[PDB]
């Protein structure tokens, strides 16, 4: 609802007002769990396959006479109990992705994006720009505002070289203000969001 606006160099820049219906609702923990699993279950390729008893090479011929030989009755040398025989059930190529009703996928983003505010783990910034791509200059900026951990830079527009001079750093990820999602926000500890990106998050919901 009310937060302190910070300049790029780390000083103060005034104060900002966040909408209460977006950053101030009571979180629904039992919903955020479901949405995280649904998005994580939909990221797996599911490319796995084995060979049945009808796909292994060979077979067909009955190994030996049904009766009188003294051995056990057998029908093919690729039966499941044989050595080089085929698998019984095993895996198979298969999709895992599923979605959730739209009114729930919008409540989860409100809950996860408001849970940070309750934990004082959100930093609103006046404007974050770099004239030239320089990873040295970016890491110093993370020293102006005490981060020392995984972050998530959300920038809306401009941002000439923000996306470049943060790739090499490990725990830092930059998303252009429409890609914000439940899984990414929950995955990263802190949340750095510029002033111009708050409106775009606000207006979509």
């Amino acid at each position: 609802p009310k937060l302190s606006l910070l300049k790029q160099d780390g000083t103060n820049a005034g104060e900002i007002t966040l909408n209460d219906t977006v950053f101030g609702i009571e979180p629904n923990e039992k919903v955020v769990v479901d949405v995280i699993l649904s998005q994580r279950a939909s990221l797996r390729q599911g490319t796995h396959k084995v060979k049945n008893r009808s796909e292994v090479r060979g077979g067909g011929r009955k190994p030996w006479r049904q009766k009188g030989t003294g051995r056990a009755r057998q029908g093919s040398i690729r039966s499941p109990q044989w050595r080089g025989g085929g698998v019984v059930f095993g895996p198979t190529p298969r999709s895992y992705a599923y979605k959730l009703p739209k009114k729930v996928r919008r409540l989860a983003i409100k809950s996860i994006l408001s849970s940070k505010v309750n934990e004082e783990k959100l930093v609103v910034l006046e404007g974050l720009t770099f004239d030239a791509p320089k990873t040295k200059e970016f890491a110093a900026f993370l020293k102006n505002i005490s981060v020392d951990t995984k972050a998530l830079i959300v920038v809306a527009g401009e941002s000439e070289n923000v996306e470049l001079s943060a790739r090499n750093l490990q725990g830092i990820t930059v998303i252009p203000a429409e890609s914000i999602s439940v899984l990414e926000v929950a995955k990263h500890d802190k949340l750095i969001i510029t002033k111009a990106a708050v409106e775009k998050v606000e207006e979509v919901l």
Binding site: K30, V32, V33, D34, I36, I112, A186, K187
Partner: protein, 146 residues
Amino acid sequence: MKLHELKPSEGSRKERNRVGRGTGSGNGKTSGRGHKGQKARSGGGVRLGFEGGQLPLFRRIPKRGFTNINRKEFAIVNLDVLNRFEDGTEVTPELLIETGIIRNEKSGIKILSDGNIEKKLTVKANKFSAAAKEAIEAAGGKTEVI
């Protein structure tokens, strides 16, 4: 959310039951199937309607009727949903579709006389029941058929 502390809603997820894994689980040797039947074999059982030879029920009662090809079915609106309109306006089928009362227009709009109306309204539609017509006439409204 602290992905290291996920806890789903209680009762929303249960555990698969796997049969044929020893006799301590109660579903071991025979796996809930009994002993030596047709139902105890792989891909066993009989058809959905089969009765073991006795004549099935559907084959000892007669067929009945036919299906009309020119069947007309009307979209139904009662009188209670007609109290959401301020008195004076002219209610028309093209107005009723937008306000969510009628999703699809099947073959026409028909007003039935369930409930009661208290606001003087003028309506237009394709059909009226006998009791519905008088109800909106006794409210000072007028009845017109498109």
